[PDB]
Structures are given as structure tokens and as C-alpha cells.
Amino acid sequence: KVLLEREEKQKDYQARKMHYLLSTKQISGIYNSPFREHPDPWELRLQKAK
Amino acid sequence: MREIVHLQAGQCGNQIGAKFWEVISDEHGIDPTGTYHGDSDLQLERINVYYNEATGGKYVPRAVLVDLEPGTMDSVRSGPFGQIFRPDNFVFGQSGAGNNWAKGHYTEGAELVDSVLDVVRKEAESCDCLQGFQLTHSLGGGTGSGMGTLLISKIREEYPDRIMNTFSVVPSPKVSDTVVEPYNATLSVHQLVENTDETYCIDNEALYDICFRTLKLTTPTYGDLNHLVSATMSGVTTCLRFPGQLNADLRKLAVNMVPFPRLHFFMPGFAPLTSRGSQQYRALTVPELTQQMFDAKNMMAACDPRHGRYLTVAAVFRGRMSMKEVDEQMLNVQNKNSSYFVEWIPNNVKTAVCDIPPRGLKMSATFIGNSTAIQELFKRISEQFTAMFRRKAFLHWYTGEGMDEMEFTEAESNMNDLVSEYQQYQDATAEE
Amino acid sequence: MRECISIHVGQAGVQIGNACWELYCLEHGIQPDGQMPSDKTIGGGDDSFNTFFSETGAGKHVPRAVFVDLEPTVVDEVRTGTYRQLFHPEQLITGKEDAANNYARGHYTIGKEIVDLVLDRIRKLADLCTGLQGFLIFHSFGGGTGSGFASLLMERLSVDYGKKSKLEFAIYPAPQVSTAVVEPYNSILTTHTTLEHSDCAFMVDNEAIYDICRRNLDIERPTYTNLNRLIGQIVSSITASLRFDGALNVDLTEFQTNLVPYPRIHFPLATYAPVISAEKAYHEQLSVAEITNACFEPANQMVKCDPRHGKYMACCMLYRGDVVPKDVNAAIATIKTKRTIQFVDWCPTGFKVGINYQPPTVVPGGDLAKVQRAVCMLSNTTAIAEAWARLDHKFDLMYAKRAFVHWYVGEGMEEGEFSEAREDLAALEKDYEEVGVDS
């Protein structure tokens, strides 16, 4: 269960780095597109804490 | 009869093609007007390889210029020989490539490609039987690399039984012109190894070093590079343009020179590279030419062949000397420098002498060989590509076009496979 | 073909456009009347003037630019000038009320009144052209006209044309010297709009111009004219391969594609050279290596930032004049091995080669001398992020007690606009920091 907690912890330090890869500006990014969705379980994490 | 269709791509490709056309016109004796002012014998019989028969003896060039920017045709047309080509072939778009391979291939590679396919199909149908297609471009930009690969793929799909030879420009970390140049190079190498017969490596920095340390020119410029590469291709093509005693063609070279299709890269080079004041003091002989074709100082490589083993070599000569000297020189070279070529395969050098000397020079000899000297370029390209792709920099531009990122993944996997193959064939041991 | 439309908002934008147009006419031999009266002695002009000017049926040149301003005084000042016979009065839109360093009025109660007219003007101008690549929007962050109106117009131009380049040129409030007090009030709101709705933004200040002019030109009595001349020379150098040709033409798209590593980070560092006076251009041997090395000196930068605090990610190299490739290669070899210059551990090299055969010209009465060649640099480094940090600190200290905020409240705007602007700037600074951090 502490391992599962680590797995949950393995989601937040991700938000540390890919905060700078939030590719949404100019309505033209990498992960997102008018055809490939708005921040989602992968891309929702690109906006979170430091 | 047996003719060669020439193709053009990229501003550097366009300028080098124009320089080559000017050089061949001058050597075969064609006035800038379009008539014939030559005074030779073989310059009329096989002259139709690159020209076409028309009324009044006015031969026309056979080369299609493909581009995305209209500013290049204006520049190349204002030259002393820009009024001799076919304006119909100057197929240029309205939007520039922006040094983007994906954007140039997708946006500027859909609605403009049809015209160039139509014109090249018309040119092929105009002749009776053909051999291959020559395309001179550069990997530095979205113009040469962006559509040259697509055109080669299309012509291979349409006409499989043709020669795909090209002289694309390899990049250099020391001398760069594009920030995303590694991306374009990685994308282009995949097509070069998947849908291309053969390819010759071209480096500007090495030619600059060659001229600076041997030619001793005051102000070397791109015109000098174009002259040198034009002379290189002229020496390459003189095997069929001017038949001699032991003539050859491109396909026999491509078969005898390429052991495996995955490795079709070569190493060009020309022998007599001297300074202006050294032209009146020189000894025209075989051993000097052999030393200048064997040494690493004269080749146009931004690398060192001595780090590996020679794989296959062709010595193409152009003059009236002998036959015994070439073979004895090769024999004593293989005997002495036994640790520079593959011992498993003897006689890795091919003899070829053109009895017809070039115009303006009496002795000329080019070097076409495939030495183990591109592996460092490949590995450094792979390393820099991985460095850029780790954090995915300059990637939004390509993603916004529509193409995904898996293409980069498969491309780098292919590069890793190719470099592994190259390195484990470099140490070609005899047995266990 | 390679044709672009210039946009001039505010007094600074209008005067900058005037300087650019007069520079173009003097460099191309275009007479102020609009036709070619040089029937006795010709002095040039047989070139491709279609990029900026237009050819009529009678041999007349019509400039292609947008001169919009609120305060009619600037329009009148230009109108009474000697170049009134060149442009058209329909291109100089007057106004009753002016923002004058205010965003709320200029974005809500003044901006939304003159919209259809300027949109119809720009639509007509675009239809008059054949090929469009980008725009030349000239404004300022301090001026209220150049902030609210620029923002509201570009927010519509972006949604009306997604395939066209959207550049930016304005002035930064210097941390040391400033003209007004409410400058960061407008800046904090303009930066968000320029970041999340534009592609590239160029930023400069005036203190650096003062320092470089007093250091090289050695003038005790500066004036705005030389400030505009420097910017005009910069712009002409940037768009040099469009009006003319060369060994390696560098169009707008060709460089702007690589100048944006991430559309977060689209704030390059321009550096013009040589910036010297007449006496500074006679007994001084000029080569390429020396000026290229001088380009990286912080003293010659138009932004007050030490490059040694950070490192470079992307670099754009330009030239103009009789430049030899061997000198360029030697300079590249010199700088790639320089230990003082810092760079990331992932980009071993990046730059461009723009060779222009046409040398830069001179102006009678100006301060620039006749230099055989010119050079411009557009690099991207994280050391410039301090300016946004200082701006954020100033905004925080001046927003805690809500200084001069009740005016904007009464004008009509939601007071959170400060909060999300602050957090967007904080996130952008965080991204800049993270990018500047190597492995």
C-alpha cells in the first residue's frame, strides 16, 4: 500500500517538470490539438504544482 | 537513345546544378545563346545525353528546377546562362519551406507535386529509353530535403528499373545553418536508406579547409564550391559522356561498389588540387595522382578514413597515360597499407581510364570510394538527435502540422540499427 | 510575393513607421512626391520595390502601412509634414478621445468604438496584395493607445488569420528610468495578450540606447530621432533578404520557424552592429570576427541583462553588406570555443547565414556613417528573465495596497485580471527557470 502511495507520488513530481511543457498557448501545441483533445489524464498533469 | 534526366531541388541544389550546366556547356563548346560553338569530335555524337535535338541545331538543357520560393529562379535566370533553360520547368510555389521538412512535405508537397510529376513524365516519354535520374539537392532546408526524397520515392515507385543517384549535402556540427538541421537530417536519412539506390556525401567545411590549405585562395566563396562539385560530377559522368578504352556506367559502379543495400554511401574526391602559383611547377605522373587520391588531405571529408578499413574503391582516370602503372600502384598499396582495407576481400580498387582528356586540363582523375569514415558522422547525428528529442525541443512546429512523434522514434531506431550494423561490419574479422 | 503589412499604433509606433518609410524611400531612391522625377540624372531605383511599395498605372508609389492613433495631435503633426503627398489621408485615422497611458478606457470604452473601420482598412490592404507572410505591428507598452488597442486588434487578427505570422515590436519600461508611473499597469495586461495570442515578441528599452549612444556616438544631447533611426536600421537589417537577394536569402518564415523553440519562449535578444558615429568609422579596421564578438557583449545589447547569468538555447545570425563566408566561418569557430559564452548542454550549434549583396546606405544629416557591412543577432537566452521578475515584483508591491486601481474599477473591468496576469507571469518565469536548468 505504501508502494501504491509511491505510485500516486509518481504522478506529482511529473507535474514538476512538464509544467514547462504545457503546450496550449497560441491554440497550437504538441500533445493537444483541435483533433487530439484538451488536457486529459496525461495532459491534465502538465499544469499542476511545483 | 540512352540519356540521363537531371533533376533540381533546393537553392544550393539549384545553384550547383546551374554551375554544372555552365561548366558542361563551356567544356563542350556551347555559346550562352544556345547554338553550338564547339570544335571537337565527340562533342556532337553523344551530346544528346543531357541535351535534346531541336531545329537549327539549338540544343536545350534537360533539367527540372523544383522549388518553393520564387526568389531563386529570378537569381539563377539573371546569370550569363540563365536564359538557355526551359522556363516551364521552373515550378516554384508561393509559400517558402521555412527550413521545415514536415511542413514542406505536407503543405507544399501536395498541390505542387503534380506539376513536376507531369513534366518529368513528359520528359521521360519524350525519349526512347533511359538509364537513371540525377538529383542534386541539399539536406539544409525544407526545399531540397523536403521534396527531393518524395520525388525520388515517386519515380522509384513509377519506374523501378532506374538509377537513383544523388549528391545531397551532409551537415556538420562545426558549420551549421539550421537550428533544426539534425531533425531534417534524421528524417532524410531514413528515406535515403529506404528508397534510394545510392548517395554521395557533400560537406562544405571540408572543401573550405581544402581550398584554404591547398588552393590558397584570397576570398573563397560558394562559387568555388560549386565549381569543385561540378568538376567532381563531370569526372563522374565522363565515363558515359566521353567513352574511351575502358568505359563504365553508373549502374555497374552502383552494383560493384555497394556490398549491401543498407550501405550505399560513398566518398568523392578529385586529384589535382593545387595553388595558383603551383600550376606552372608540377610533374604530371601516376604516383603523384595515386598519392593525392589515397591521402586524407585531398579528400573532401569532414572526417578521417584512417580510423576504419577501406571497403570498396574505384579509381576513375581521365587522360592518356597507361594501364600497367595503375595496377602496380594498387598492388603495392594493398601490400604495404594492408591494415587500411578489408583483408577478407582482395582487390578492392577498380581501374577505369577515360582516353578523352577534359577541356582546359590535360590530366584529371576523380576518387569514388566507400571508406569507413561516415560512422562518426552517423553516431554524432544520433547523439545530437537524442539530445534534442529527450526534452522535445523545437517540436511544436512539427506537431502542429499534423504528423505525430512516432516517426522520430522509428527513425532513431533505424539509425541505431544502421550504426550498429556499420560498426559490426567495420571489424570484419576473417573467422572466430 | 514577399509582401507584408505594417501596423503603427500610438505616437511611438507612428514615428517609428515614419522613420522606416523615410529610410526605405531614401535607400531605394524614392522621391517624396511619389513618382520618379529624376529624368536628368538617375541615382538608382531599378529594383523590386513591390515588397513594401506599390506600382500604379501612372508611375506612383503607395505605401502599405497602418497609421492609426487616438490623439489627433500626432496625425496632425505628421500631416503638416513634408511627406503628406506620399501616403493617403484615409490611412491616418484620427480620434476624439485618447487613452494616454491607460488600458481600461482604451480597451473597453474607446477601443471598441473604432473597430469596423480599421478592420475594413486592413482587409482592403490585404486584398490589394498578392502574397502575405507576416505583419509589422509597432506599438508600446507604456502608451495606453499602444497597449489596449494593440491587444484588442491583435486578438481579432489572430482569430481571422491563423496561417499568417504575427510579429511584435514595442518598448520596455526600463527599471532605472521611466516616463510615467502606470506603465507596469498596462504592461502586466499586455504581456499576457502578447504571450498567449502571438507568435514572436521583440523587446527593447531606451536606457541601453542612451548608454550605447553616449559610449560610441559620444553625444551629450540625445534626441528621439536617433532612437528611431537605430530601430529603423534594425528593422531594415531584419527584412533585408526580402527587398533584395543574396547568396543565402533568409525570409521571414525561414528564421521565425527556428526563432521559436517553444511558443512560451519567443523573446529573442536583438543586437545591432556596428553602432558607431562618423568619426568612429574612419580609422577603425572593420572585419566580421571583431563585430561578431562585440555582438555578444552586454554593453552593446539593447536589453540591460548580463548574458553570463544564463545561457543560450537558440541563436539567429544575420548579415548585410560585403561579407565573405570565410570570415563567417572563422568567427563561428572562434565563438564555439569561447569559454565566456555559456550555452546549454543539448544544442551544440545553431545559427543562420544571411548574405546580402546590397550594402547599407546612409542618410544626409544622420549620425550613421558609410559602413561596408552590417550585422544583426537574434539569440534566445534565459538571462533576460530578470526583467519579468522585476516587473512582477513592482506589480506585487504596487498592487498590495491597490494604488491607482479605483480608476480601472470605475471604468469597468474585473479586478481579477491582475491576479491571473500575475500567476501567468509567475508560471512563465517558472518555465523559463526550468528550461534554463540543464541536466
Return phi, psi of residue B279, to 5°.
Answer: -70, -35
Is the domain of B293 the same as that of B175?
Answer: no
CB proximity list for C312: less than 8 A, separation 6 or greater: C341, C342, C343, C344, C347, C379, C380, C381
Q: What amino acid is encoded at C30 in this protein?
A: I
Structural domain including B398 reads 375-425
Q: What amino acid is encoded at B378 in this protein?
A: F
**Grid cell digits, residue B27:** 567544356
Residue that is written with C-alpha cell 505510485 in the block: A7
Q: Which of C329, C348, C353 has its CB closest to that of B384?
A: C348
Distance CA C431, CA C423 (A): 12
Phi-psi region of B153 (alpha: psi -120 to 50; beta: other; left: phi over 0): alpha
Note whether C410 and C356 are within 8 A (CB).
no
Nearest of B40, B43, B23, B44 to residue B270 by alpha carbon: B23
Distance CA C77, CA C325 (A): 46
Distance CA B48, CA B61 (A): 10
Angstrom CA distances, B63 to B18, B84, B152, stand at 10, 11, 15
Nearest of A35, A38, A43, A34 to residue A14 by alpha carbon: A43
Residue of B nearest to C330 (CA): B175
Is the domain of B146 the same as that of B272?
Answer: no
- Residues of C labelled catalytic: 254
Question: Where are any strands of DSSP class E within chain A?
Answer: none
Q: What amino acid is encoded at B84 in this protein?
A: I
Element (H, E) at C304: none
Note whether C140 and C12 are within 8 A (CB).
yes
Residue that is written with C-alpha cell 512563465 in the block: C428
Is the domain of B81 the same as that of B20?
Answer: yes
Total Cβ atoms within 10 A of residue B105:
22
**Does B246 reside within a domain?**
yes
Residues written for chain B: 432
Residue that is written with C-alpha cell 593545387 in the block: B274
Chain A adjacent subunits, 3+ CB pairs under 8 A:
B, C
Nearest of B201, B204, B108, B173 to residue B147 by alpha carbon: B108
Residue that is written with C-alpha cell 515578441 in the block: C201
Distance CA C163, CA C134 (A): 9
Distance CA C184, CA C178 (A): 10
Total Cβ atoms within 10 A of residue C91:
16
Residue C411: HSE in the Cβ half-sphere, 13 Å Cα cutoff = 18
Distance CA C374, CA B23 (A): 34
Task: Determine contact: A24 vs chain B, CB below 8 A.
Answer: no
Residues written for chain C: 439
Is the domain of B367 the same as that of B391?
Answer: no
**Does B32 reside within a domain?**
yes
Give the per-residue SS3 of chain B: CCEEEEEEECHHHHHHHHHHHHHHHHHHCECCCCCECCCCCHHHHCHHHCEECCHHHCCEECEEEEECCCHHHHHHHCCCCCCCCCHHHCEECCCCCCCCHHHHHHCCCCCCHHHHHHHHHHHHHHCCCEEEEEEECCCCCCCHHHHHHHHHHHHHHHCCCCEEEECCECCCCCCCCCCCHHHHHHHHHHHHHHCCCCEECECHHHHHHHHHHHHCCCCCCHHHHHHHHHHHHHHHHHHHHCCCCCCCCHHHHHHHHCCECCECEEECCECCCCCHHHCCCCCCCHHHHHHHHHCCCCCCCCCCHHHCCECEEEEEEECCCCCHHHHHHHHHHHHHCCCCECCCCCCCEEEEEECCCCCCCCCEEEEEEECCCCHHHHHHHHHHHHHHHHHCCCCHHHHHHCCCCHHHHHHHHHHHHHHHHHHHHHCCCCCC
Pairing of strands C373-381, C312-321: antiparallel
Q: Which of A17, A20, A28 has its CB closest to that of C263?
A: A28
**Does B323 reside within a domain?**
yes
Partners of B220 on chain C (C-beta within 8 Å) are 325-326
Structural domain ending residue among the three candidates B374, B394, B409:
B374
Q: Virtual CA dihedral for B381, B383, B387, B392, nearest 10 degrees?
A: 60
Residue C179 annotated as binding site: yes
Residue C242: HSE in the Cβ half-sphere, 13 Å Cα cutoff = 24
**Does B432 reside within a domain?**
no
Q: Which of B392, B395, B400 has its CB closest to that of A28?
A: B400
Structural domain ending residue among the three candidates B224, B257, B290:
B257
Nearest of C252, C253, C238, C270 to residue C360 by alpha carbon: C238
Q: What amino acid is encoded at C437 in this protein?
A: V
**Quick check: C346 and B173 CB within 8 A?**
no
Method: cryo-EM
C-alpha torsion sign, points B270, B273, B279, B281? negative
Is the domain of B135 the same as that of B170?
Answer: yes
Q: What is the CATH number of the domain that holds B200?
A: 3.40.50.1440
Residue B96: HSE in the Cβ half-sphere, 13 Å Cα cutoff = 27
Total Cβ atoms within 10 A of residue B13:
29
**Does B19 reside within a domain?**
yes
What secondary structure does DSSP assign to C92-140, as a single string?
EE--SS--SS-SHIIIIISTTTSSHHHHHHHHHHHHH-S-EEEEEEE--
- Please give the DSSP secondary-structure letter assigned to residue C75: H
Residue of A nearest to C433 (CA): A20
Distance CA C32, CA C198 (A): 35
Structural domain ending residue among the three candidates B356, B374, B392:
B374
Bridge partners for B45 per DSSP = none
Q: What amino acid is encoded at A27 in this protein?
A: I
C-alpha torsion sign, points B285, B291, B297, B303? positive
B207-211 long-range contacts, Cβ below 8 Å, gap at least 24? B207/B300, B208/B175, B208/C325, B208/C326, B208/C329, B210/B273, B210/B297, B210/B298, B210/B300
b vs e for C109-138, b when ≥16 Cβ sit within 10 Å of the residue's Cβ? ebbeebeeebeebbeebbeeeeebbbbbbb
**Grid cell digits, residue C216:** 560610441
Is the domain of B325 the same as that of B384?
Answer: no
**Does B174 reside within a domain?**
yes
Is the domain of B225 the same as that of B168?
Answer: yes
**Does B431 reside within a domain?**
no
CB proximity list for B107: less than 8 A, separation 6 or greater: B95, B401
Residues written for chain A: 50
Nearest of B330, B318, B326 to residue B365 by alpha carbon: B318
Element (H, E) at C80: none
Q: What amino acid is encoded at B173 in this protein?
A: P
Note whether C244 and C358 are within 8 A (CB).
yes
Is the domain of B353 the same as that of B379?
Answer: no
**Grid cell digits, residue C19:** 522613420
Distance CA B376, CA B339 (A): 19
Partners of C314 on chain B (C-beta within 8 Å) are 179, 394
Angstrom CA distances, B71 to B78, C138, C163, C243, C368, stand at 11, 27, 21, 10, 30
End-to-end CA distance of chain C: 44
**Grid cell digits, residue B221:** 566563396
Is the domain of B130 the same as that of B150?
Answer: yes
Q: What amino acid is encoded at C144 in this protein?
A: G
Total Cβ atoms within 10 A of residue C169:
25
Question: Where are any strands of DSSP class E within C211-308?
Answer: 269-273
Nearest of C205, C206, C189 to residue C197 by alpha carbon: C189
Return the SS3 of C322.
coil
b vs e for B57-89, b when ≥16 Cβ sit within 10 Å of the residue's Cβ? eebebbbbbbbbbebbbebbbeeebbebbeeeb
**Grid cell digits, residue C61:** 508609389
Partners of A18 on chain C (C-beta within 8 Å) are none
**Quick check: C263 and A17 CB within 8 A?**
no
**Grid cell digits, residue B189:** 536519412
Element (H, E) at C239: none
b vs e for C251-278, b when ≥16 Cβ sit within 10 Å of the residue's Cβ? bbbbbbbbbbbbbbbbbbbbbbbbbbee
Residue B244 annotated as binding site: no
Q: Which of C245, C257, C313 has its CB closest to that of B100?
A: C257
Residue C128: HSE in the Cβ half-sphere, 13 Å Cα cutoff = 19
Q: What is the CATH number of the domain that holds B321?
A: 3.30.1330.20
3-state DSSP helix/strand/coil % of chain C, to nearest 5 = 45, 15, 45
Note whether C296 and C335 are within 8 A (CB).
yes
**Does B430 reside within a domain?**
no
For an interface test with B, the pick among C349, C356, C378 (most B C-beta atoms closer than 10 Å) comes out as: C349
Note whether B137 and B10 are within 8 A (CB).
yes
Angstrom CA distances, B401 to A28, B5, B84, B182, stand at 10, 33, 38, 18
Is the domain of B43 the same as that of B156?
Answer: yes
Pairing of strands B265-266, B199-200: parallel
Is the domain of B357 the same as that of B273?
Answer: yes
**Quick check: B395 and A28 CB within 8 A?**
no
Residue C6 annotated as binding site: no
Q: What is the CATH number of the domain that holds B415?
A: 1.10.287.600
Structural domain count of chain B: 3
Residue B226 annotated as binding site: yes
Note whether C102 and C405 are within 8 A (CB).
no
Q: What amino acid is encoded at C282 in this protein?
A: Y
In Å, how far is C124's CA from the nearest CA of chain A?
26
Distance CA C412, CA C416 (A): 12
Residue C71 annotated as binding site: yes
Bridge partners for B415 per DSSP = none
User: Chains B and C: how many Cβ contacts under 8 Å?
Assistant: 90
Note whether B225 and B219 are within 8 A (CB).
no
Distance CA B418, CA A41 (A): 37
Is the domain of B140 the same as that of B182?
Answer: yes
Nearest of C91, C72, C85 to residue C32 by alpha carbon: C85
Residue B45: HSE in the Cβ half-sphere, 13 Å Cα cutoff = 7
Task: Determine contact: A48 vs chain C, CB below 8 A.
Answer: no
